[PDB]
């Protein structure tokens, strides 16, 4: 785990679907889409 202070620069915008971080709002709001949208074919498996 986190011994102590690891995440010093906690970004404001952070995705929950995958778990990524961003600086701008549009960047995230435009990224999250990747998950939810309209894909032709996908394994949708993990
Ligand atoms: Zn994401």
From Swiss-Prot:
* ZnF start-end (C2H2-type): 13-35
Q: Where in the cell is it found?
A: Nucleus
**Transmembrane segment boundaries:** none
Superkingdom assignment: Eukaryota
Family per record: Belongs to the krueppel C2H2-type zinc-finger protein family.
- Sum up the protein's function in the record's words: May be involved in transcriptional regulation.
Q: Please report the name of this protein according to its UniProt entry.
A: Zinc finger protein 484
Native source organism of the sequence: Homo sapiens
- What is this protein's gene name? ZNF484
Please indicate which part of the intact protein appears here, giving the first and last residue numbers and the full length.
Answer: 715 to 747 of 852
